[PDB]
Enzyme design. Sequence first.
Site, PDB file in Angstrom:
ATOM      1  N   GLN A 192      33.952 106.602  10.837  1.00 61.71           N
ATOM      2  CA  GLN A 192      34.419 105.242  11.062  1.00 61.71           C
ATOM      3  C   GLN A 192      33.316 104.185  11.096  1.00 61.71           C
ATOM      4  O   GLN A 192      33.452 103.123  10.487  1.00 61.71           O
ATOM      5  CB  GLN A 192      35.211 105.225  12.380  1.00 61.71           C
ATOM      6  CG  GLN A 192      35.867 103.899  12.708  1.00 61.71           C
ATOM      7  CD  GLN A 192      36.897 104.056  13.797  1.00 61.71           C
ATOM      8  OE1 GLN A 192      37.957 104.650  13.597  1.00 61.71           O
ATOM      9  NE2 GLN A 192      36.613 103.526  14.969  1.00 61.71           N
ATOM     10  N   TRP A 221      39.232  99.669  22.067  1.00 63.04           N
ATOM     11  CA  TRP A 221      38.003  98.939  22.319  1.00 63.04           C
ATOM     12  C   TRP A 221      36.795  99.503  21.573  1.00 63.04           C
ATOM     13  O   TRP A 221      35.995  98.735  21.048  1.00 63.04           O
ATOM     14  CB  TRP A 221      37.691  98.881  23.806  1.00 63.04           C
ATOM     15  CG  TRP A 221      36.528  97.990  24.065  1.00 63.04           C
ATOM     16  CD1 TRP A 221      35.309  98.346  24.556  1.00 63.04           C
ATOM     17  CD2 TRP A 221      36.455  96.595  23.779  1.00 63.04           C
ATOM     18  NE1 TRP A 221      34.490  97.249  24.629  1.00 63.04           N
ATOM     19  CE2 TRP A 221      35.168  96.157  24.153  1.00 63.04           C
ATOM     20  CE3 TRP A 221      37.363  95.663  23.258  1.00 63.04           C
ATOM     21  CZ2 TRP A 221      34.766  94.830  24.016  1.00 63.04           C
ATOM     22  CZ3 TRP A 221      36.963  94.347  23.125  1.00 63.04           C
ATOM     23  CH2 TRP A 221      35.679  93.942  23.501  1.00 63.04           C
ATOM     24  N   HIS A 233      43.981  99.614  15.716  1.00 63.73           N
ATOM     25  CA  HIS A 233      44.906  99.757  16.829  1.00 63.73           C
ATOM     26  C   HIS A 233      44.446  98.923  18.023  1.00 63.73           C
ATOM     27  O   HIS A 233      45.099  98.947  19.062  1.00 63.73           O
ATOM     28  CB  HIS A 233      45.094 101.231  17.210  1.00 63.73           C
ATOM     29  CG  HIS A 233      43.864 101.911  17.715  1.00 63.73           C
ATOM     30  ND1 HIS A 233      42.671 101.939  17.025  1.00 63.73           N
ATOM     31  CD2 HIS A 233      43.654 102.601  18.841  1.00 63.73           C
ATOM     32  CE1 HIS A 233      41.779 102.621  17.725  1.00 63.73           C
ATOM     33  NE2 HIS A 233      42.354 103.032  18.832  1.00 63.73           N
ATOM     34  N   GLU A 239      32.950  98.461  17.298  1.00 69.18           N
ATOM     35  CA  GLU A 239      32.330  98.877  16.052  1.00 69.18           C
ATOM     36  C   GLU A 239      32.545  97.846  14.942  1.00 69.18           C
ATOM     37  O   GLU A 239      31.647  97.620  14.136  1.00 69.18           O
ATOM     38  CB  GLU A 239      32.843 100.266  15.642  1.00 69.18           C
ATOM     39  CG  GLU A 239      32.409 101.367  16.601  1.00 69.18           C
ATOM     40  CD  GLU A 239      33.118 102.698  16.433  1.00 69.18           C
ATOM     41  OE1 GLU A 239      33.857 102.861  15.435  1.00 69.18           O
ATOM     42  OE2 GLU A 239      32.937 103.578  17.305  1.00 69.18           O
ATOM     43  N   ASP A 259      33.140 108.302  34.601  1.00 72.36           N
ATOM     44  CA  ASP A 259      34.021 107.624  33.661  1.00 72.36           C
ATOM     45  C   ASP A 259      35.241 107.072  34.393  1.00 72.36           C
ATOM     46  O   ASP A 259      35.583 107.540  35.477  1.00 72.36           O
ATOM     47  CB  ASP A 259      34.449 108.575  32.521  1.00 72.36           C
ATOM     48  CG  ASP A 259      35.166 107.909  31.352  1.00 72.36           C
ATOM     49  OD1 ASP A 259      34.593 106.960  30.766  1.00 72.36           O
ATOM     50  OD2 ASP A 259      36.294 108.342  31.017  1.00 72.36           O
ATOM     51  N   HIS A 274      36.161 109.364  25.076  1.00 76.90           N
ATOM     52  CA  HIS A 274      35.572 109.238  26.403  1.00 76.90           C
ATOM     53  C   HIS A 274      34.170 109.845  26.442  1.00 76.90           C
ATOM     54  O   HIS A 274      33.291 109.321  27.126  1.00 76.90           O
ATOM     55  CB  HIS A 274      36.476 109.882  27.461  1.00 76.90           C
ATOM     56  CG  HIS A 274      37.793 109.197  27.588  1.00 76.90           C
ATOM     57  ND1 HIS A 274      39.002 109.859  27.605  1.00 76.90           N
ATOM     58  CD2 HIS A 274      38.076 107.894  27.707  1.00 76.90           C
ATOM     59  CE1 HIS A 274      39.979 108.973  27.728  1.00 76.90           C
ATOM     60  NE2 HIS A 274      39.438 107.774  27.787  1.00 76.90           N
ATOM     61  N   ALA A 321      47.425 102.442  25.477  1.00 76.44           N
ATOM     62  CA  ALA A 321      46.291 102.193  26.353  1.00 76.44           C
ATOM     63  C   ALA A 321      46.322 100.766  26.897  1.00 76.44           C
ATOM     64  O   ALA A 321      47.277 100.393  27.575  1.00 76.44           O
ATOM     65  CB  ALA A 321      44.985 102.506  25.618  1.00 76.44           C
ATOM     66  N   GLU A 322      45.278  99.984  26.597  1.00 74.85           N
ATOM     67  CA  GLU A 322      45.213  98.572  26.942  1.00 74.85           C
ATOM     68  C   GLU A 322      45.300  97.712  25.683  1.00 74.85           C
ATOM     69  O   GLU A 322      45.213  96.489  25.757  1.00 74.85           O
ATOM     70  CB  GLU A 322      43.910  98.256  27.715  1.00 74.85           C
ATOM     71  CG  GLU A 322      42.613  98.530  26.959  1.00 74.85           C
ATOM     72  CD  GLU A 322      42.364  99.985  26.614  1.00 74.85           C
ATOM     73  OE1 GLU A 322      42.607 100.851  27.486  1.00 74.85           O
ATOM     74  OE2 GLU A 322      41.926 100.262  25.472  1.00 74.85           O
ATOM     75  N   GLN A 323      45.526  98.366  24.539  1.00 78.14           N
ATOM     76  CA  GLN A 323      45.307  97.774  23.228  1.00 78.14           C
ATOM     77  C   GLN A 323      46.133  96.521  22.953  1.00 78.14           C
ATOM     78  O   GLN A 323      45.719  95.665  22.171  1.00 78.14           O
ATOM     79  CB  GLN A 323      45.633  98.808  22.160  1.00 78.14           C
ATOM     80  CG  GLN A 323      44.747 100.038  22.234  1.00 78.14           C
ATOM     81  CD  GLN A 323      45.360 101.208  21.530  1.00 78.14           C
ATOM     82  OE1 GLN A 323      46.385 101.092  20.837  1.00 78.14           O
ATOM     83  NE2 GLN A 323      44.744 102.369  21.704  1.00 78.14           N
TER      84      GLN A 323
END
Length: 450
Positions: free
Chosen positions: A328, A346, A343, A351, A105, A15, A366-368
């Site tokens: 990463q 987002w 995973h 990336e 946020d 975040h 999450a929303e994954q």
Amino acid sequence: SQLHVAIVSSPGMGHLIPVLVLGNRLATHHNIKITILAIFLKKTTLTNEEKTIEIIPVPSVDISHLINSSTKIFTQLRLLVREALPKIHSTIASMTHRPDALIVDIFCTQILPIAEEFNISKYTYHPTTAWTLALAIYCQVFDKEIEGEYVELKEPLKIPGCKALRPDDVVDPLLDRSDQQYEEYVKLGKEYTDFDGILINTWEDLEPETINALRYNEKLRLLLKVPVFPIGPLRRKVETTLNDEVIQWLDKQNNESVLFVSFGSGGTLSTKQMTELAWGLELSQQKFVWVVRPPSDGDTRDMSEYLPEGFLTRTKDMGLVVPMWANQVEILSHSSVGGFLTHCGWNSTVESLTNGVPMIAWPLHAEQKMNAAMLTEELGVAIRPAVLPTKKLVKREEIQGMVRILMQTKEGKRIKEKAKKLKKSAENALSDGGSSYNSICELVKDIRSR
């Protein structure tokens, strides 16, 4: 006179980091003073603390006397930024110059009272997709329209102007209507429509239908009524780390030869799944790099203690194991990387596409699970198992197959070339004249009008 913008960060790096990226984008391109009220890989304001970017710490409140074990992460993160809003109230009361606009946020929406009190232009950040956003909003209607759990639904949910969301690809707050996190999510969806705008980490080409649904669809505009700003794809910029063994090994590998594997800072497999994934990677006969965390079945351990016996010995030449963390963005950018098991978070997703890397969707939280379907079905830049790995173990047969596909099959080559084109579109939206460069300048406008 240079604008003074405040940004508010929910706890965590997933975040905080976007917030930072956002800040740097704005300040670099348009000339705006950035203050952040956050609640060898980064180094934050390296030299960015020249009255330019400035991070004020304010992460101070315990919630141990208000949660339990079973209390879900969403609610916890909603609480943290509530316990003592007063802290924030007085923080902004003690700003020597009040900002001309505040950008909060996704999990710091509960800050409206304050924004209204100091009468500052208030905006919200949605660090993931517009489709997930559209859902988050429209969920205030479904809450009534559907009676019963959403996973029980026999038919999909159709958000005005947008693709149909299946019972298997729901966001986690919709898995249980009898938890508090659901209520918070509907509340969130209702809160968005009070801000003076909504920034979203996406661009036009990627979500043209959805963005133009939010903006123009009658049904949605009877809820929303605020502007929308596709500013993405915003991501960390490739850093420099001379000594980085991962890199030194990758420099010996051929172009697009390696598959990267890492489930983000939240992700943790169960012990068996990890064993099958190991055997999968072993049986694929493909080169890989794997950021492994200890296996939670709900575990500080050496690499040998949690992996299959002799695994490291056998795969010594075929793979590189990386405990806990690996840098990463830098790995993703590297020439020898031509695949990413993710995973579907987002940040990571962004990336990957920005480097033109194809993906294997392995959604977890999450929303994954919703983002996975979007990547696979609609965009065709990712593949996924037959059964979502949250619901059922993905054994070494399907894993093996899935690996071989992406890397060496012609279909694998089709998906890679798709990711590459989306990389171009990203470099076209962000460029000086693109949709996301211009859309930022519309936010600029809107902050000056206020």
